[PDB]
Amino acid sequence: LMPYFLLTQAVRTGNLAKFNQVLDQFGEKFQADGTYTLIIRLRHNVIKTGVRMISLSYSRISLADIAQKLQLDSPEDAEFIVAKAIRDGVIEASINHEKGYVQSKEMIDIYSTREPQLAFHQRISFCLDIHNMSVKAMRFP
Amino acid sequence: VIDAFRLINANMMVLGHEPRQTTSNLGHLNKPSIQALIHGLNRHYYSITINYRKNELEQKMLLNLHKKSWMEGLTLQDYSEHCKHNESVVKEMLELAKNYNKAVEEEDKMTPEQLAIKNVGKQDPKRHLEEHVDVLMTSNIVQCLAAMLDTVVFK
Amino acid sequence: AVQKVVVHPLVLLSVVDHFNRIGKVGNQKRVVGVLLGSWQKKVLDVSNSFAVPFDEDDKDDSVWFLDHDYLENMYGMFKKVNARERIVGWYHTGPKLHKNDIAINELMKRYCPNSVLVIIDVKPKDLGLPTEAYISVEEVHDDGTPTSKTFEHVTSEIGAEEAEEVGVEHLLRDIKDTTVGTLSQRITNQVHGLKGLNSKLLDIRSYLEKVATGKLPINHQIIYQLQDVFNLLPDVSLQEFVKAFYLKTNDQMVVVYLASLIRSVVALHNLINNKIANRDAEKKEG
Amino acid sequence: LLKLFTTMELMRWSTLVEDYGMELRKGSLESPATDVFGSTEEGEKRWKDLKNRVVEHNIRIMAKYYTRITMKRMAQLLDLSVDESEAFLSNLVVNKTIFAKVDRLAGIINFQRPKDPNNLLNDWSQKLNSLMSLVNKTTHLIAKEEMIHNLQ
Amino acid sequence: DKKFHGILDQGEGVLIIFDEPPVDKTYEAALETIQNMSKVVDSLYNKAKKLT
Amino acid sequence: QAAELFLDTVSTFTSYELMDYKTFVTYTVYVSMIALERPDLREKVIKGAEILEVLHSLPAVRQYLFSLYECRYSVFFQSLAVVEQEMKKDWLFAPHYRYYVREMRIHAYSQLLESYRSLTLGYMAEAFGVGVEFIDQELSRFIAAGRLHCKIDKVNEIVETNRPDSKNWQYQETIKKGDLLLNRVQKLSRVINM
Amino acid sequence: QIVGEVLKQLTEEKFIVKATNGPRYVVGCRRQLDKSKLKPGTRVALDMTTLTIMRYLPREVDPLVYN
Amino acid sequence: LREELQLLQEQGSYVGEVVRAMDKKKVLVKVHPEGKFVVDVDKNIDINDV
Amino acid sequence: EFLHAQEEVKRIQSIPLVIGQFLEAVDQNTAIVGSTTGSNYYVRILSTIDRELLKPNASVALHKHSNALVDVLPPEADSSIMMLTSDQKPDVMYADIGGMDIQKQEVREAVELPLTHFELYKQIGIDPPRGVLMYGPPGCGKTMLAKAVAHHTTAAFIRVVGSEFVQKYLGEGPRMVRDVFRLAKENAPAIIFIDEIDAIATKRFDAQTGADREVQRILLELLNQMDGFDQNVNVKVIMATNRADTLDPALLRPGRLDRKIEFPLPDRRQKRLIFSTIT
Amino acid sequence: TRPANHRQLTFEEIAKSAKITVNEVELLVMKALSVGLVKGSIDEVDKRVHMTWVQPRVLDLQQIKGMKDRLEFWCTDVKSMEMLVEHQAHDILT
Ligand SMILES: Nc1ncnc2c1ncn2[C@@H]1O[C@H](COP(=O)(O)OP(=O)(O)O)[C@@H](O)[C@H]1O
């Protein structure tokens, strides 16, 4: 996990050369585990992960600023990346071809207080199977 | 209590006493009171069994009409006293939190039933059972369903 | 003149039995007597009943007879045994009311100034109504309408007599008409509540339809004065749900966290305790 | 008195000085009126005391009628400018007479207390029970009038 | 020091005053019940009886 | 846990154990500063007469403690750096990159931006030191860390905070704890049926 | 109806009442006896059978001294 | 438990301080409200059990 | 059907109950309660309520016609009034008293136990005093130290009032001592202050006259409660008396109360100090 | 006619209904509140008047079909939702 820790730091930072070196150093075990094809995929999706974190960080971030932050050096590539992030639905960052506007959040609506209970009311479903297992597992002799 | 008996003359006792005749019906649920036993009444002859004329056109009339709750099941009562009731419910179950806490560190390794009998506390697992929590849960959902049912009626 | 009346669960069955016992030879379908009780705080209550044989003829509804001397002797005996009891009104069966009621009310009002009429449905049990109350108001039908009888219904609610709970519980002892089985009982409470709402509102819709057809006289002067507000009251605006998006949904989600989870945890605790006991018993049995 | 006491009329004192201001110039006796308003120094002080008195009266009656009123209209109704209207509006609220909240940048006011969701659903339930009672009363009324109307 | 109820919107040069509803203490009380009824029981009991 | 059992000013010796009573106080001040920003700490440590006396003994220690209490960031950051430098010369240096100055300013920035909605980066920079870019990069780093509940409008250089209501923030806490306990009960569901 | 003095109010519906001679009982107003106006030390009428207070009563005036 | 409540409607059991245990299944007993009350002995306890 | 039956049997009257003070829970399903009129009879304890509020000698609630244990009242002070929690209220702080000291060093010695120091009572091997009797006239106030001290170190203060205690409530006199002791035991920072002992409460030179035996029994139970205290917690008990000659030796003997303090007349130099403080 | 269906009584709608000027709307709605025609909130940013009536009058009994249709609409909605919740509750009521 020490190179994995450095991989996590590289993912957060967004740099490329540093982790490419350590992959060349200790990437053989990753090949043995069978994730080296994914490892390269993370190496080139590091910018995607950085965009999500910085998009969660900022309200209206400049397309030039995000390009400089994640080493894009191109306004068009930055516009494409945020285009590719919104179409994946991972983040809510939108595009305004004027300067790159992104909407903010809003107050809590009808279903925003109800989506936890809707996704968590399976508690009784666990309760019923626990009771049913007890039904199966209370043999007296 | 509606107990009926008969006074007897002196001849019934000198003959075969217990004037209760030869049958196995008045011996059903025949428990005369201790003060009745030491008095002659309810002891001289017998205790009379009681029955109620629960005939139909009379009993169906009583149950249908007297105990009347027919459109009163549509009450909503979302938070008339329930916001503070939920505050009390949380506080009571916070006490259950401490009680169900107290239990998990008792939890001794000597057949905990042995510990439980001599250290009863009437905690959430023992006496303040899940049924009380069910009562709180039923109260919440009933107000929920009533409010939601009328919400979709509101069209 | 009374604001409202409240009927006890004390006289309804007595009237029905009186109908049954005097209907053996009198098949007029018309049972007429007096209801006795008390009126203290604009709330009228009935505590005793009595039936008198009573015959009718359809000719102008003016053929009848009663036993007034016996009925008056009953009232004196009832007042002697219980002073607070007084004749609060006179009752007649046969909800299809005829025209002799005005003559009966005029004769009996010497016992009660605000004479009232009561109809008991011995055989009918339509939805839950045991009886209906009637107040005599002939002080002009309306502002611009001709003269009429216009016997109106003073609001009636079934009261809660004391010391009869013991008897009724012992009597039935089979249905248990209480909130017992809270979840299932409230489901039944929701069921017949919807049944009552659907039946009564359908009756109101039928009345509006029949008013539209005009086959019956239209009492619109009170119908629209009472139903217009009912219709226009803004219970359909959903923006107050928008303002109260968390009307209680916060309490809904805590109950999910703190009733369903708690039930799951305590059930889980019971099972794992049983599983430990069963595993130990299996391993240490021999 | 009949005009200026009740029914929440717009007490535009500019109109009142000629509609009901005749007591200043000539009335039946006009001797108390000249003592009150016909005086020079104390009369003009009482004139100003009538001028404001109708302003709080106009604010108070507007409170129970209009929830949100634009700043220009309220100032015109108070016969003053924006700053003078807001100054008196501040004078009422510091006395707890009215429940008023103003957005000074937007120049918009509100007089309704924010309805807590607890009591908001309570009045909804009370509205529901009022409807339920109306159903019961209408059902008894129509069914019995149905019984009278089919006695044929 | 929580003596006032508002937020200072310097961008608009204003301060938005909001009437905070304090009846929402059920929220925090519920969380405390969650914390002191679950953490103290599930970890301790089911780590002691790891084998079942 | 440190502070709750360490504000007790009952020393076994007048000047021993932790090298002094003055060093005992400096540990108290550092631990308290990591602990909390500004609740009624005026009635917890400031009301402490022995506390006020020892800050009279140490003016520099009194300087930043009052600077945090007065929320004057112009002197706070300079004094906060001096605090970090002093902690460097101390063997109790374990929070070398977590809780010297970053955690305290996280409390300070949270204290500052709360009761605010949109405070400009340029003016908050001069009110909190100098180097508008330095504060801008500091805010971006700390927002990425997770705290400082706000967002930056870079195209207009504004700090638009997002403070949840008492209902909203607390409801967020419940759904987080709901996530943890669902993870717990699922683990317990694994414990059963095996 | 037996007469006592309510020592204290157990709950909103439970009231601890001392019989002037015998033991303290507790009673409870049924529906409309205005439990708010009842105070610790008030005078109420009780019945060993009806289980409740049927009506409330003010105080005394030292009659021998009064006349 | 309901039957226990109905039994306790008759005060249930009465506390007595046993003093003298006579041979003919008789114990004098002392009761706080009144005092001595000579009575028989229950079936579950013998004469010597007193 | 059986969930319905289980919800059917739980009626238990659900009706206005009564109070007969509980004596002690002998076992489960068996109990001994004492009704207020005496009539101590054994009852059956339901499983609904138990040790969670079933403290040995606290006032409890019982069915009206059944007298069965249903509920227990937590509060004990308001059962017979006799003052209540005078804590959390500065009436006369401490140094603002005009009486200066008289001694006030044995009183500060008395407040040492409320002022923690019970841990310092051990280790150091001291046996701290438990009962302080002040056999002084109304000079120095004789309650300005009890109204203070309770606020100097935050502690509950109860007036008790001995004259009120001796009344028809002689049967519940033992019960009220148990209740007030439980209130004291509930709050370790508390002090019991009893007044007017000399004239009425268990005078020893004058023969018993009617209800005097009842007063002696009440003192006997108060002695029982103070012996049951046995330094379990840090509560303190102080009686204020004008003359301790008539007091019973049971309280006067060491081992129950030891510290005797006399508060003399205004002490002219102190009297001028009292006037200056009051003025 | 509109049971809160159109609860936005804008100035233009008021102008259509009463052919009155803008300044007279304030007096007209004032007298409406006094008599009892409309008792709802009166705004001016959007000029919205909330709709409550407590003084009913003749509803043109020849046009009773409108209220009959609305009432039967309520009947259909209530019965449909009652059947829907019954469908969701066959696992308890059946
Ligand atoms: N500063 C003070 N110093 C001394 N006595 C005071 C002071 N302030 C008030 N007092 C008096 O002390 C009195 C206490 O009286 P009381 O309690 O009846 O005496 P005892 O406690 O002996 O029965 C009060 O009446 C009050 O007037």
Tell me which H or E stretch contains I194. Answer: strand I190-194
At residue I11, the 3 state secondary structure works out as coil
Q: Which residue's structure tokens are 């006395």? A: D95
- Measure CA C84 to chain center: 25
A117, with CB counted inside 10 A (0-12, 13-18, 19+), is buried
DSSP letters, F83-108, are HHHHHHTSS----SSSTTTHHHHHHH
Is I228 within any annotated ligand binding site? no
List of chains touching A (3+ CB pairs within 8 A): C, F
Phi and psi dihedrals of I11, rounded to 5? -105, -45
Residue J38: CB partners within 8 Å, gap ≥ 6?
J9, J29, J32, J49, J50, J51, J52, J53
CA distance linking residue B146 with residue B78, whole number of Å? 8
User: Which residues, listed in sequence order, are joined to residue I192 by a DSSP beta bridge?
Assistant: I158, I237
Of the partner residues E6, E20, E46, the one whose CB lies closest to the CB of residue F115: E6
The residues, ordered by sequence, that sit 6+ positions from I222 with a Cβ below 8 Å of its Cβ are I177, I251
Q: Which amino acid is at C259?
A: A
Find out whether C258 and B93 touch, Cβ atoms under 8 Å: yes
Q: Which DSSP helix (H) or strand (E) runs through C14?
A: helix C12-22
- Is the CB of residue E52 less than 8 Å from the CB of residue F191? yes
Closest residue, chain H, to I38 (C-alpha): H33
With CB atoms and an 8 Å threshold, state whether F174 touches E42: no
The helix or strand, by DSSP H or E, that contains position I35, with its residue range, turns out to be strand I31-35
End-to-end CA distance of chain A: 51
Closest atom of ligand 1 relative to the I196 alpha carbon? 23
I136 annotated ligand binder: yes
Structure-token pair, residue B14: 């000198």
Residues contacting C29, CB < 8 A, separation 6+: C93, C94
Q: Least CA distance to F192: which residue of chain C?
A: C272
C64 half-sphere exposure, CB direction, 13 A CA radius: 24
Three-state helix/strand/coil letters over C252-271: HHHHHHHHHHHHHHHHHHHH
Cβ-defined contacts of D50-56 (< 8 Å, 24+):
D50/D13, D51/D13, D52/D88, D54/D11, D54/D12, D54/D13, D54/D16, D55/D79, D55/D80, D55/D88, D56/D88, D56/D91, D56/D92, D56/D97
Q: Which residues pair with I18 in a beta bridge?
A: I62
E23 closest CB neighbour out of D101, D104, D116: D116
Distance CA D99, CA D63 (A): 8
Q: Does D114 touch chain E (CB under 8 A)?
A: yes
Helix (H, G, I), strand (E, B) or coil at C146: coil
Q: Chain B partners of C263 at a C-beta cutoff of 8 Å? A: 130, 133-134, 137
Q: Do chains A and E touch (3 or more CB pairs under 8 A)?
A: no
Instruction: Transcribe F20-83 into DSSP letters.
Output: -SHHHHHHHHHHHHHH-SSSTTIIIIIS-HHHHHHHHH-HHHHHHHHHHHHT-HHHHHHHHHHH
Distance of CA F19 to the CA centre of its chain: 26
Q: Is G51 left (phi over 0), alpha (psi -120 to 50) or beta?
A: left
Of C128, I97, C18, C235, the residue nearest D136 (C-alpha):
C128
Q: Beta strands I236-241 and I131-135: pairing type?
A: parallel
Q: β-pairing, D66-68 with J42-43?
A: parallel
* F85 sits in which H/E element: helix F73-88
In contact, G60 and G45? CB cutoff 8 Å: no
SS3 assignment, position F96: coil
- The one-letter code for the residue type at D10 is L
- Written as one letter, the residue type at I195 is D
Give the technique used to solve this structure.
Answer: cryo-EM
The CB density around residue I100, as the number of other CB atoms within 10 Å, is: 14
Q: What's the CA gap between B108 and H27, in Å, rounded?
A: 45
DSSP string across C68-137 = HHHHHHHHHHHHHH-TT-EEEEEEE--SS--STHHHHHHHHTTT-SS-EEEEE-SS--SSS--EEEEEE-
What DSSP line would sit under B101-136, residue for residue?
HHHHHH--SS-HHHHHHHT----TTTTS-HHHHHHH
**Distance of alpha carbon I207 from its chain centroid, rounded?**
27
User: What gap in Å lies between CA G52 and CA G32, rounded to an integer?
Assistant: 11
Q: Which residues, in sequence order, are bridge partners of residue G57? A: G43
**Residue D131 sits at the chain B interface (C-beta within 8 Å):** no
Which chain C residues are within 8 Å of D142, Cβ to Cβ?
203-204, 207, 223
> Quick check: helix, strand or coil at residue J23?
helix
Amino acid at residue number A66? I
Residue E27 buriedness (CB in 10 A; 0-12 / 13-18 / 19+): buried
* I and B in touch (3+ CB pairs within 8 angstroms): yes
Q: DSSP characters for I148-179?
A: TTTTTTT-EEE---HHHHSSSTTSSHHHHHHH
Cα distances (Å, whole numbers) of residue I104 to E47, I94, I188, I235: 57, 10, 22, 19
The reply to whether I139 sits in an annotated binding site is: yes
Q: Are C196 and B71 in contact (CB under 8 A)?
A: yes
One-character DSSP codes across C149-215: --EE---EEE---SSHHHHHHHHH-SS--SS-SHHHHHHHHHHHHHHHHHHHHHHHHHHHHHHHHTS
The token duo for B110 is 């000597």
Q: Which residue has the tokens 């996704």?
A: A119
Across the interface, which of C20, C248, C262 has its CB nearest the CB of B79?
C248
- The ligand 1 atom nearest the CA atom of I140: 4
> Is residue H9 a contact partner of residue B1, using CB atoms and an 8 Å limit?
no
Q: Please count the residue pairs, one from chain G and one from chain I, whose beta carbons lie less than 8 angstroms apart.
A: 48
At residue I260, φ and ψ (nearest 5 deg) are: -105, 120
With H, G, I as helix, E, B as strand and everything else as coil, classify residue B61: helix
Distances in Å between the alpha carbon of C213 and those of A64, J61, J64, J75? 75, 11, 10, 20
What tokens does F173 get? 């806490």
Nearest-CA neighbor of C108 among C50, C40, C60, C169? C50
Taking alpha carbons only, the member of B108, B115, A130 closest to residue A138 is A130
8 A C-beta contact, residue C20 and residue C122: yes
Residues 6+ apart with CB under 8 A from D119: B79
Contact H15 I68 (CB under 8 A): no
Tokens describing residue D128: 């529901």
Q: Which atom of ligand 1 is nearest to the CA of I137?
A: 22
3-class DSSP assignment, residue I118: helix
Q: Strand order of the sheet with strand I156-158? A: I156-158, I190-194, I236-241, I131-135, I259-261
Which positions ≥6 away from C241 have C-beta within 8 Å? A110, B151, C247
E23 contacts D114? CB cut-off 8 A: no
| Protein residue closest via CA to atom 15 of ligand 1 | I141
**Residue C254: its chain E contacts at CB < 8 A?**
26-27, 30
D118 interaction partners in chain E (CB closer than 8 Å): 23
Q: Is I143 annotated as a binding residue?
A: yes
Q: Mind giving me the DSSP string for I124-147?
A: TT-----EEEEE--STT-SSHHHH
Cα separation of F160 and B76, whole Å?
A: 41
Are chains A and G touching, using the cut-off of 8 Å on CB pairs and a minimum of 3 such pairs? no
Half-sphere exposure of G67 (CA within 13 A, CB side): 2
With beta carbons less than 8 A apart as the criterion, state whether A104 and F162 touch. Answer: yes
Query: What span, in angstroms and rounded, lies between the C-alpha atoms of I35 and I41?
Result: 8
Domain ranges across chain C: 2-182, 223-282
Return the residue matching tokens 């130099």: I269
> For residue F89, which amino acid is it?
K
The strand ranges marked E within J1-94 are 42-43
Question: Rounded CA gap, F121 and F94, in Å?
Answer: 32
Cα C218 from Cα C142, distance rounded (Å): 13
* DSSP bridge pairs for F119: F159
- Which residue, chain included where needed, has tokens 């507000």? C229
Q: Is I274 in the pocket of ligand 1 (CB under 6 A)?
A: yes
What φ, ψ does residue D29 adopt, rounded to 5°?
-125, -30
CB contact under 8 A, E21 and F167: yes
CA-nearest of I191, I254, I246, I258 to I219 is I246
Contact A121, F182 (CB under 8 A): no
Amino acid letter for position B63: L
How many CA atoms lie within 13 Å of C192's alpha carbon, on the beta-carbon side?
13
CB I57 within 8 A of CB I22: yes
Tokens of D144: 């019995």
CB count in 10 Å sphere of residue A28: 11
The sign of the dihedral angle between the CA atoms of F12, F18, F24, F27 is: negative
Rounded Cα–Cα distance for residues J55 and C162 (Å): 42
Q: How far is CA J46 from CA A134, C112, J49, in A?
A: 63, 60, 9
- Residue F183 contacts C, CB cutoff 8 Å: no
DSSP track, D86-120: HHHHHHHHTTTSS--EEETTTTEEE-SPP--HHHH
Is the separation of the CB atoms in F22 and F14 below 8 Å?
A: no
Strand pairing of I31-35 and I20-24? antiparallel
Q: Are I18 and G25 in contact (CB under 8 A)?
A: yes
Question: Would the CB of I162 count as within 6 Å of ligand 1?
Answer: no
I57-79 per-residue burial string, b: 16 or more CB within 10 A, e: under 16: bbbbbbbbebbbbbbbbeebbbb
**What does chain G look like in DSSP terms, one character per residue?**
-EEEEEEE-SSSS-EEEEESSSPEEEE---SSS-TTT--TT-EEEE-TTT-SEEEEE-----HHHH-
What residue type is J19 in one-letter code?
A: K
Q: Which residues pair with I194 in a beta bridge?
A: I239
State the DSSP H helix or E strand holding residue I23, giving kind and residue range, or none if neither: strand I20-24
Residue with tokens 């190496």: A43
Q: Is I246 in the pocket of ligand 1 (CB under 6 A)?
A: no
I31/I25 Cα distance (integer angstroms)? 5
Q: Residue C126: which residues within 8 A CB-CB, separation 6 or more? A: none
- How far is the C-alpha of C31 from the C-alpha of C27, rounded, in Å? 9
With tokens 């001595």, the residue in question is H36
Q: A89 in the Ramachandran plot: left (φ > 0), alpha (ψ -120 to 50) or beta?
A: left
Backbone angles phi, psi at D44, to 5 degrees: -70, -30
Q: Measured in whole angstroms, how far is the alpha carbon of residue C236 from the centre of its chain? A: 29
* Beta-bridge mates of residue C86: C37
Calculate Rg over the CA atoms of chain J. 19
Q: CA I136, CA I266: separation in Å to the nearest integer?
A: 12
Range B11-20, long-range pairs (CB < 8 A, 24+ positions): B12/B44, B12/B45, B13/B44, B18/B46, B19/B44, B19/B45, B19/B46, B20/B45, B20/B46
Pair C170, D108: CB distance under 8 Å:
no
Please give the angle made by the CA atoms of E35, E41 and E43, to the nearest 5 degrees: 95
I237's tokens: 């008990």
* Min Cα separation F105/chain A (Å): 18
Q: Are A103 and A91 in contact (CB under 8 A)?
A: no
The answer to whether residue I18 neighbours chain H at the CB level (below 8 Å) is no
The HSE-up count of residue C122 (CA atoms within 13 Å, CB side) is: 18
CA pair distance I228, G58, nearest whole angstrom: 42
- Look at strands I60-63 and I17-18 and give their pairing: antiparallel
- Separation between Cα atoms, residue C249 and residue E18, nearest integer Å: 22
Mutation choice for ligand 1 from I92, I143, I270, CB with most ligand atoms inside 8 A: I143
Q: What are phi and psi of I127, to 5 degrees?
A: -110, 100
Q: Which helix (H) or strand (E) holds E16?
A: strand E14-17
- The residue nearest atom 5 of ligand 1, judged by CA position, is I141
Tell me how far apart the alpha carbons of residues F105 and F18 are, in angstroms, rounded to a whole number: 27
Task: Please identify which residue in the block is written with the tokens 């998990």.
Answer: B104
Q: What span, in angstroms and rounded, lies between the C-alpha atoms of C104 and C68? A: 12
Residues of chain B neighbouring D128 (CB-CB closer than 8 A): 74-76, 150
Spatial neighbors of F80 by CB under 8 A, at least 6 apart, are: F64, F101, F104, F105
Residue B66 contacts residue C130 (beta carbons within 8 Å): yes
3-state secondary structure of F7: coil
Residue nearest to ligand 1 atom 18, measured at CA: I138
Taking a C-beta distance cutoff of 8 angstroms, is the pair F29, F65 a contact?
A: yes
Residues I97/I102/I104/I106 CA torsion (nearest 10 deg): -160
DSSP string, I69-93: EEEE-S--GGGS-S----TT--SS-
As a whole number of angstroms, the distance between CA C141 and CA C145 comes to 6
